[PDB]
Design a protein around this ligand. Sequence first.
Ligand code: CLA
Ligand code: CLA
Ligand code: CLA
Ligand code: CLA
Ligand code: CLA
Ligand code: CLA
Ligand SMILES: CCCCCC(=O)OC\C(C=C=C1C(C)(C)C[C@H](OC(C)=O)C[C@@]1(C)O)=C/C=C/C(C)=C/C=C/C=C(C)/C=C/C=C(\C)C(=O)C[C@@]12O[C@]1(C)C[C@@H](O)CC2(C)C
Ligand SMILES: CC1=C(/C=C/C(C)=C/C=C/C(C)=C/C=C/C=C(C)/C=C/C=C(C)/C=C/C2=C(C)CCCC2(C)C)C(C)(C)CCC1
Ligand SMILES: CC1=C(/C=C/C(C)=C/C=C/C(C)=C\C=C\C=C(C)\C=C\C=C(C)\C=C\C2=C(C)CCCC2(C)C)C(C)(C)CCC1
Ligand SMILES: CC1=C(C/C=C(\C)CCC[C@H](C)CCC[C@H](C)CCCC(C)C)C(=O)c2ccccc2C1=O
Ligand code: SF4
Ligand code: SF4
Lengths: 140, 733, 33, 80, 106, 87, 30, 161
Amino acid sequence: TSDVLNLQIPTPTFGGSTGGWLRAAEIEEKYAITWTSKKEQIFEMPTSGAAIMQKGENLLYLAKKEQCLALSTQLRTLFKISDYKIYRIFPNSEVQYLHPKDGVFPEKLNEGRIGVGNVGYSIGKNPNPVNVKFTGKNTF
Amino acid sequence: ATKFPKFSQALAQDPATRRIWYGIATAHDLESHDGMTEENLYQKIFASHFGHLAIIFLWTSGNLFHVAWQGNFQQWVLNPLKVKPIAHAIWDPHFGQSAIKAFTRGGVSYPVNIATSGVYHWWYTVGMRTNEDLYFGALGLLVLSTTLLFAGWLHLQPKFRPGIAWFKNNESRLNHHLSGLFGVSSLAWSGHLIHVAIPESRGQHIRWNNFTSTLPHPEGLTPFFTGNWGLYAENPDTAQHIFGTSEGAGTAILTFLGGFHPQTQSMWLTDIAHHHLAIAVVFIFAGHMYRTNWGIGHSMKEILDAHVPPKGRLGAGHRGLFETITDSLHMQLGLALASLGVATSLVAQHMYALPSYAFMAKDYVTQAALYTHHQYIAGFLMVGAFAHGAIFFVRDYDPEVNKDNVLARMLQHKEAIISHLSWVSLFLGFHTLGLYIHNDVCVAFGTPEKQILFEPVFAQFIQAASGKALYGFDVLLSSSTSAASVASSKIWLPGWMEAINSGKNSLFLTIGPGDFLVHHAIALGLHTTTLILVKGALDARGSKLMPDKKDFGYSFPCDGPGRGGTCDISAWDAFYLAMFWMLNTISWVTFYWHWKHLTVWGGNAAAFNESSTYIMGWLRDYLWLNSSPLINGYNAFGMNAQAVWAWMFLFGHLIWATGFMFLISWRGYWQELIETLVWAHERTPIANLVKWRDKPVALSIVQARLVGLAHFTVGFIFTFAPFVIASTTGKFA
Amino acid sequence: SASFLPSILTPVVTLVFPGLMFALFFVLIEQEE
Amino acid sequence: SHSVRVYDTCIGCTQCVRACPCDVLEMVPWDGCKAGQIASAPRAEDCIGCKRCETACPTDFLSVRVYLGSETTRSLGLTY
Amino acid sequence: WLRDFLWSQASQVIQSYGSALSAYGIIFLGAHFIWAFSLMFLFSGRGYWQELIESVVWAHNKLKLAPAIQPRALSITQGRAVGLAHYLLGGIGTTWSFFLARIISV
Amino acid sequence: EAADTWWGDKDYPPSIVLGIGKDVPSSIFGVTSGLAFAIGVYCVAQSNLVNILSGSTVNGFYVAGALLVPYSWGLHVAAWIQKQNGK
Amino acid sequence: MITDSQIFFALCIALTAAVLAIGLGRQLYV
Amino acid sequence: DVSGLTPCKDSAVFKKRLDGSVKKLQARLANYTEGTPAYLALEQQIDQTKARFAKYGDKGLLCGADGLPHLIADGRPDHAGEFVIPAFGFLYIAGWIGWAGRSYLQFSKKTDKPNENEIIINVPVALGMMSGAFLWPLAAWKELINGQLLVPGDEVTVSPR
Ligand code: CLA
Ligand code: CLA
Ligand code: CLA
Ligand code: CLA
Ligand code: CLA
Ligand code: CLA
Ligand SMILES: CCCCCC(=O)OC\C(C=C=C1C(C)(C)C[C@H](OC(C)=O)C[C@@]1(C)O)=C/C=C/C(C)=C/C=C/C=C(C)/C=C/C=C(\C)C(=O)C[C@@]12O[C@]1(C)C[C@@H](O)CC2(C)C
Ligand SMILES: CC1=C(/C=C/C(C)=C/C=C/C(C)=C/C=C/C=C(C)/C=C/C=C(C)/C=C/C2=C(C)CCCC2(C)C)C(C)(C)CCC1
Ligand SMILES: CC1=C(/C=C/C(C)=C/C=C/C(C)=C\C=C\C=C(C)\C=C\C=C(C)\C=C\C2=C(C)CCCC2(C)C)C(C)(C)CCC1
Ligand SMILES: CC1=C(C/C=C(\C)CCC[C@H](C)CCC[C@H](C)CCCC(C)C)C(=O)c2ccccc2C1=O
Ligand code: SF4
Ligand code: SF4
């Protein structure tokens, strides 16, 4: 999708945990994940505890991308939900779309992606670190 | 930018406390800083050399000033065998009354520390007799440190920074070092000995006001110019000289009697000046070797490029070694540390074997402390040389420059080298531990006659070949009417034989089966430390588990838990592992030296000879027995002057113990603990208004290994030094 | 009279100097661009 | 931020992308193997450096390589 | 504690040689050895030992002595477990021998 | 710089390894090697046939002649180098 | 015995050395 | 003799150690009634101590100033009862063990399941190689001359360096 997030999506019913985001989420960086459910059931939170996911649409704020992707892995390998979307909320109310970027999962091939970081030789043909001395660059 | 690691943009953007630790820890790594060129690197190293030299001379000037001001040099000169030398006076507002009376010792009336560095004997030999002389030496070294600091400031100026071609001038630098810094300095020391120290030993008072009008020899430059150099050797000091006075003295300035002065139990001062003169001439001739500006001389590149055995025995010979050494500061530094480590181990052996300072080999505390000092420093330099060789392999070794070189062939057959070091270490460890455990069980079962006691016949044969005549080998120097015993029979032999065949010297101590076993233990330690260091240096560029190790640098945490697990895989981790083994083998060497000399000084060498063959003998006769004056420095009934040594003993125990924290527990546990503490501080009232600037994180893996190793080493040193000082002080023998 | 110099210099140096150096070093650590 | 590189010994078996916990890796089209795809690292700023991709590579001496470098608030995995 | 408990009560266990309590002194020394042997596993890491095993495997391969069951270093969890077990065995053995040799002889 | 002194692909070193004596023929090198060896062995034999004393019997001519024994090693090596080079 | 004037002279020389050490350290600079 | 050592048959400290060793057990003997197996065990210990000391005196061992035998690992022929003859014995036995292991390794490599032949040993074949390794210095020399003992060196795996 695009960089838009519905702030009024209902949240899973949770009793409050001591694992939530700290002061550096309203200051630096915050993440949210939204998914669609078919029934009311109980899932384990990545910040400990258990929460009931609402039937319909859900929204949940986390502190790092690892927590959102671990929750997405739980929503995949368990009871099948595969339309989750992970965002990144800045303190100036600016949202950025991260997971399912091109609309499809990264493991499936998608025409229109550009290879980044690809190297045109085997790993044993990197230059020696003597040849990059006093240059600032590296042999990667 | 304005952030603290101005030299590392990567570290300055770290939002955590890791930035401060890594900025402190990588301050001197001048090769990896941001925007560093070779010329600027060499200039900064030159300035740092000047600053470090100034630090050395300031430290020596401080020693001189404190002995001059708060010392008892006046009283110690008049009676060296009974007056305790003084380091400095103690100022402590934490002292009680009984600590003030307990530390009030020597001839002074204030609390005071007794010097165990032997600076009193050294200054007493070289002509110091009053506190004014020490104060003037302190002033001279202060002015020298000031001059060196100004020179270091001056050579970073834009018109005084030397170019890169000046630094890589190997022939000129080695010529000037070998001639000047060695030979001319040795010649000047021989001149000082002959002009000041030898006349001061004979009762004359030679200082800056009368040295230019007092002849050191009665003739004076006439035997030197005419060629009758043997006139300087006639009439030596008789064996009734009494150091510092004139009865039985001589008028000789260059002799080679050999052996020891009979009263001071040290070598003759005329032997030392002659030795320095010979070394001076040899070093000037040796510095007359390399071509600098006048056609004659060698080129170091041609010598290295020529030395190829005829049919591929050593590959391409030493071709390309000149380019690798000059362009890599890590190889030069590694060679320097290896040579210096050999040198300081040599000084450790020779200063107890052949003492040169008057009235040492009778203090026994300076004698123990200096040996342990120099042996630990030797171990440190030896480990550092291999560490910098590993660094040179990581980021300075060019494989195309060294094609089929004598250095690349070392990497070609590195597996054979590591496997054979493994075989030697395993063989030595198996056999010496088996012999020690066999002797333990045999002594424990009431049958000490079943012990395996190998007589060390090779080293005893060497002692006999040097002249020792109780083993009955009757070979070379021990047997008269031999070519070796006749050829030197009228130069240095009689003094050497009267010094080696007496029982009061440390020259070639009598050795038995315990010496055999502990020498095998020492060889085990040396081979295993060499194993770890050589394996790290040779596998620094890669192995089967990590073929691209050179891309990740010299020091990195790991390569993940994949393909089995890659804990401690870098060459830095090989250094970290070999540090423990160096500490272990230096502890073995110092334990052997200290117990052997403790039994010899007390006239009870049979105790060592009987109890050194099994481990329980060591444990109950050296460590348990000699700790009694140390741990009783303070108790429930009071305290004495060894309370500070007891406190430092427990201090070293605690530091060595808290090293095991960082060495055994690893980051994850501590990172989760830090996160819980972060929640605690952020979610408590009153105290959450105080906010950190750097986010607290756990110590990194390499940082943790370094911190635990530094703790281990500091605790090691601070628990061995109080024992080796207080046990010798608590027995006086 | 040189019997005052320990009791003057040792507290001044050992206490006052590294405290000011710690404060100055901390301030220089935490200043930014 | 750490730097991730993928070399041409890739076989396109997708295990590195599945093993990634930070959505760093993705599959782009390619013609150098039978699967017709090669791994890519377009989001290396979200790399934490846990090297789960390197454990999942089946090729002899892994094609996807993670070099630990500069540390940020994302590569340190800090929630505070 | 150090002077009046450990140093003062180890006299029975260090002087037990040549008597009926000499096994306690033997176990004292052996448990010290095992406790120190634990720190080898507790401080070091797997990758160094794997590379050293590679260097040994080269010589074995050279002499046609390579086992088909390929030799590997102990795993990280196993290395920690071995170090901990050796540490506990050495400590409990040292305390066991010290207590028994002290309290039997007084 | 310097000269190409590497000879790993040849059975003998080039003549330029001798520096200032790169043009001396092999016969002079061998004759001087034998003479220097004989004189040096005689000079060092004058230190064990006669007991060298503290200043009385030192005889600095025998000392200067004693340096011919290591010099005789270099002369017979240079004799071989010039012989293989054809000079 | 070392007089007070000698100790103060040594202190002055050490102070000059300290100022030069500061100059060298700030010539290498941070 | 060698290193100033005296023979143990001519050493007074060795005899003093003999007397102390037998006197300790004799003092231990005085609290037991005769005919009891404790008494018989203690007198057997005394006889064993006397026999051991007599053997150490008769074998020609050299004792030092402490009265304990000192082994001369020099290689002299008169001290070949020390290190050298046990050296030859151990070298033969260790070569036997190594050659038996190597032969079974070759056999297990040449089979269809090399891994299962090393955790579960083929006992008849293992006993065959184990007993046939008695001529290891000849078989190893024959394999060395035939070129089967050593791999050429370009066929063993090596780290990149
Ligand atoms: C004759 C002229 C001369 C002299 C005297 C020196 C002297 C020095 N140069 Mg130097 N240099 C020269 C010409 C000369 N240079 C030239 C022509 C060049 C250019 C080609 C250089 C280029 C150069 C560089 C690039 C550097 C130096 C450095 C140094 C210093 C070495 C550090 C030191 O103190 O070691 C002193 C060491 C000894 C006196 C001997 C140590 C070895 C022995 C075996 C020790 C044991 C002796 C004895 C037993 C000790 C016991 C004493 C007592 C405790 C009992 C030293 C002051 C370095 C330095 O520090 O820079 C400031 C440095 O980085 N020089
Ligand atoms: C014709 C050749 C010849 C010969 C055979 C001699 C022989 C001798 N001269 Mg002599 N001399 C000569 C020409 C000669 N001179 C000339 C042309 C002059 C200048 C006018 C001098 C000026 C001279 C002086 C000023 C002195 C002698 C002395 C001596 C005697 C020293 C003996 C000895 O063992 O030296 C001792 C050897 C050494 C000290 C070291 C030997 C190593 C070499 C030979 C040193 C040579 C100098 C050396 C290069 C350093 C000088 C460099 C300078 C810049 C510092 C000896 C009999 C000395 C003497 O007492 O005479 C009775 C003396 O003081 N000579
Ligand atoms: C003449 C000797 C000499 C010189 C010039 C150098 C120079 C260098 N070494 Mg080095 N080294 C040496 C000796 C030397 N070393 C020895 C003897 C060892 C063996 C112990 C080492 C081991 C070593 C390693 C393992 C490494 C270096 C590295 C380096 C480079 C960067 C230094 C750095 O970042 O430190 C900055 C300064 C510090 C980190 C200060 C740390 C303070 C230490 C830990 C002591 C603290 C304990 C303290 C005294 C306790 C107080 C006790 C009290 C409370 C009682 C630099 C080129 C590193 C490098 O860049 O290589 C690629 C590297 O990895 N060296
Ligand atoms: C007391 C503690 C201790 C002991 C005994 C050892 C022992 C050993 N370490 Mg070690 N190490 C230790 C602490 C210790 N370490 C610590 C604290 C560290 C810091 C992390 C290290 C770091 C370290 C490194 C980095 C290396 C070693 C290596 C070695 C081996 C050296 C070879 C050797 O001596 O073989 C002798 C073997 C032994 C002493 C083990 C005991 C074996 C048995 C029980 C001996 C019994 C005697 C007798 C033969 C019995 C007959 C057997 C019977 C069946 C017939 C050996 C296994 C090196 C290695 O593996 O190279 C090959 C090596 O590279 N260690
Ligand atoms: C590095 C050598 C060195 C060392 C370790 C010491 C150590 C000591 N001095 Mg001292 N001192 C030294 C050199 C040294 N001195 C020199 C050269 C002088 C002549 C000016 C003096 C003059 C002096 C006096 C007059 C007094 C001391 C006192 C003391 C003691 C208390 C500390 C103090 O207040 O110092 C204060 C010291 C100074 C103000 C002089 C500066 C010391 C040198 C020049 C600095 C060297 C720095 C060194 C290289 C380390 C650099 C790194 C550092 C920045 C971390 C302490 C034992 C006091 C004492 O006796 O207490 C019982 C005391 O009253 N010192
Ligand atoms: C019979 C098998 C056998 C043979 C011939 C060898 C031969 C060799 N090993 Mg070795 N090794 C073996 C088994 C064997 N090993 C085993 C099982 C281990 C694991 C514990 C090791 C661990 C090992 C190390 C760590 C090192 C060697 C080294 C060496 C070489 C030097 C000799 C030495 O140090 O021996 C010492 C041997 C040992 C300490 C291990 C002995 C263990 C037992 C007693 C042998 C196995 C017998 C086997 C069970 C018999 C079953 C066969 C039967 C069914 C017929 C040599 C090539 C060293 C080297 O590389 O030097 C170049 C070296 O550093 N080996
Ligand atoms: C007039 C004599 C005639 C016979 C001799 C002779 O001419 O044969 C020459 C010859 C063969 C030949 C010939 C040819 C040249 C090939 C062809 C000739 O035909 C012609 C002209 O073409 C014929 C022939 C047969 O001659 C071969 C020569 C071999 C030679 C000359 C071999 C020297 C080793 C030196 C060593 C090992 C030094 C060790 C030195 C040592 C160990 C030391 O320096 C110790 C030292 O303590 C010393 C001593 C002094 C101290 O300061 C320094 C120290 C402490 C270190
Ligand atoms: C890592 C590395 C490195 C390092 C290395 C090292 C550290 C080494 C060491 C080495 C060593 C540490 C060696 C040693 C040696 C020694 C010797 C070589 C000795 C000799 C001696 C002699 C020869 C003597 C003889 C004699 C005499 C004369 C007297 C009498 C007796 C007798 C006979 C004994 C480097 C940087 C280079 C680079 C590369 C890498
Ligand atoms: C005389 C004597 C002595 C000496 C000795 C010596 C010095 C020796 C040496 C030795 C040596 C120097 C050796 C070397 C070697 C080399 C090699 C190279 C080897 C090898 C081996 C092998 C290879 C083996 C193999 C095998 C077999 C055959 C069997 C088992 C199995 C195996 C496979 C392992 C002494 C004094 C002690 C004492 C007296 C006597
Ligand atoms: C030494 C060591 C190894 C190497 C250890 C190995 C390969 C264990 C070898 C097991 C042997 C083969 C079991 C039998 C031991 C001896 C053959 C028998 C000795 C018997 C005595 C009682 C005499 C690791 O793999 C390791 C891994 C992680 C952390 C630390 C370490 C570690 O310290
Ligand atoms: S995280 Fe720790 S245990 Fe795991 S590979 Fe890295 S260093 Fe080894
Ligand atoms: S290091 Fe971790 S986060 Fe980065 S690409 Fe590999 S698996 Fe993904």
